[PDB]
């Protein structure tokens with residue numbers, strides 16, 4: 152009955168994964184969650200917390216193993232070592248689901264509406280907050296993101312994605328209750344609470360501005376990862392990108408190269424950047440591109456700016472530096488010939504400012520975020536400005552090809568657009584390159600694993616959202632209310 156349960160927690164946990172992309176099955180989030188809620192019924196604190204652990208291990212285990220595809224091909228570690236690192240990651244994250252189920256069974260032992268719809272959402276908010284906070288965090292696989300093409304999307308520009316996580320744990324809980332006690336009362340309250348925001352799906356917190364419509368192009372280079380940083384790749388890369396960029400120079404007002412597309416130091420690319428900038432300002436176009444900067448011996452993962460209304464200068468401020476690093480790591484991959492020899496000294500990154508002004512470019516304001524940073528809703532929100540015309544993010548997702556990793560990243564990126572009511576310009580090396588609407592919709596997209604340019608028209612938008620104005624604290628107030636009430 153119990154062991155049968157645990158096998159079950161693993162199963163409902165892995166059922167969690169199918170809510171996210173590329174599966175896009177959003178009710179699987181509810182099923183997964185009420186799986187957790189219901190399976191934690193009728194058991195002692197510890198056994199329960201172990202069930203929570205098994206649930207989390209189902210989820211993260213089925214859902215972020217793609218980290219392997221990175222560390223195994225590009226770390227070079229034995230093999231069993233890699234698999235160990237992955238299973239350890241999943242398990243570590245499942246400590247949190249266990250802390251959730253733990254404190255839940257300890258402080259609220261009986262199968263009630265109190266437990267499923269008042270305790271669990273507040274507790275889950277704090278345990279997920281922790282999961283995303285401790286050790287710089289890893290807020291990956293939050294069920295709210297499944298609602299991006301789904302109803303409930305309305306909540307996000309009001310109180311953010313975490314409010315959708317809240318509402319989903321609540322609703323799923325009441326369904327768990329309704330189910331195991333065969334009582335229609337929790338079911339009814341579930342359906343009501345789930346359906347209240349459906350009309351929020353149609354509020355437009357923003358105003359289109361067709362007068363500022365432009366042609367945008369994003370060059371998807373598709374430099375193979377293994378080579379990407381070889382001294383003998385550099386020029387084929389600069390040629391690939393320059394030549395993709397050249398026939399658009401009179402027609403596309405704005406062009407983006409993805410993360411560290413220019414795979415060399417800025418100061419070592421001064422002549423190329425100056426000529427490119429000169430040709431750009433002549434033809435009337437603008438460029439935004441990834442590149443690396445070693446400043447005086449601090450090394451920054453960087454976006455720089457060139458072209459019309461944005462003349463290049465190594466001393467310009469119109470630049471962005473990546474803020475969020477993995478608690479270890481973020482180095483520059485070595486030369487191919489040097490990667491097998493390493494186990495038998497790399498350059499690591501320094502952090503850019505938590506708050507960095509928009510990039511200015513051709514009279515466009517761009518709130519930038521590099522790669523992973525686009526999943527940090529709060530940080531993006533803080534860097535966001537009322538005058539911001541677009542969200543910018545550039546990434547290299549080639550570390551995990553063909554995995555679900557890229558699609559999960561993409562999905563979470565859409566939520567920034569929805570949250571802040573701005574279009575999102577998403578440029579990738581081989582990853583998912585796309586233009587996302589001010590409501591998280593995918594306006595334009597190009598296939599991955601292709602060398603290709605995305606070219607389309609984009610219309611920026613203005614005006615704040617409740618979530619733009621407030622950020623997290625209304626949901627935090629709701630949480631504190633719920634939790635302090637939850638101590639009865």
Ligand SMILES: CCCCCCCS[C@@H]1O[C@H](CO)[C@@H](O)[C@H](O)[C@H]1O
Nearest residue numbers: 189190191192193194262330331332
């Ligand atoms: C014909 C129905 C007979 C069963 C009535 C009470 C069964 S027992 C009850 O059932 C719940 C769901 O199975 C469990 O979660 C709970 O721990 C258990 O005590």
Ligand SMILES: CCCCCCCS[C@@H]1O[C@H](CO)[C@@H](O)[C@H](O)[C@H]1O
Nearest residue numbers: 397400425426427428429430433434
């Ligand atoms: C500051 C450095 C300026 C360098 C000027 C080089 C411009 S070369 C470039 O050549 C292309 C070849 O077809 C022409 O189509 C394009 O119009 C011209 O801008």
